[PDB]
Amino acid sequence: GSMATVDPEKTLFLDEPMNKVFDWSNSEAPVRDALWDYYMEKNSRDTIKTEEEMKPVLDMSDDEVKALAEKVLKK
Ligand SMILES: [Zn+2]
Ligand SMILES: [Zn+2]
Ligand SMILES: [Zn+2]
Ligand SMILES: [Zn+2]
Ligand SMILES: [Zn+2]
């Protein structure tokens, strides 16, 4: 029979912990939550504008999410 792992992790890149995928971050929050906080702080904690700016992030490829994170989060 198969020795393959049962139900292997299939986590989306946006749902991985910041400090798992980015060696420059110490946060344990999912990438998408770190990006959300960046936009919230930019928008004085207006969730409506924040949701508009986050929408395109969900259509980004993983390489684009890394590029965005390094632009706005890596400080
Ligand atoms: Zn076998
Ligand atoms: Zn299962
Ligand atoms: Zn993971
Ligand atoms: Zn979350
Ligand atoms: Zn904040």
Q: What was the structure determination method?
A: X-ray
Which residue in the block uniquely carries the two structure tokens 């919230």?
A: 40
Q: Are 18 and 28 in contact (CB under 8 A)?
A: yes
Q: 10 CA distance to ligand 1 centroid (A)? A: 24
Domain count, the chain: 1
- Residues linked to residue 30 through DSSP beta bridges, in sequence order: 17
Find out whether 7 is annotated in a ligand binding site.
yes
Q: Which residues contact 7 (CB under 8 A, 6 or more apart)?
A: none
Nearest to 71 by CA among 11, 60, 28: 60
Query: In what helix (H) or strand (E) does residue 48 lie, and over which residues does it extend?
Result: helix 47-54
Q: Say whether 28 counts as a known binding-site residue.
A: no
- Backbone phi, then psi, for 30, in 5-degree steps? -60, 145
Ligand 1 centroid, distance to 4 Cα (angstroms)? 10
User: What resolution in Å is listed for this PDB structure?
Assistant: 1.6
Please tell me the distance from the alpha carbon of residue 67 to that of residue 38, in angstroms, as a whole number: 14
Alpha carbon distance 7, 24 (integer Å) = 30
Query: What residue numbers bound the domain in which 6 lies?
Result: 1-75
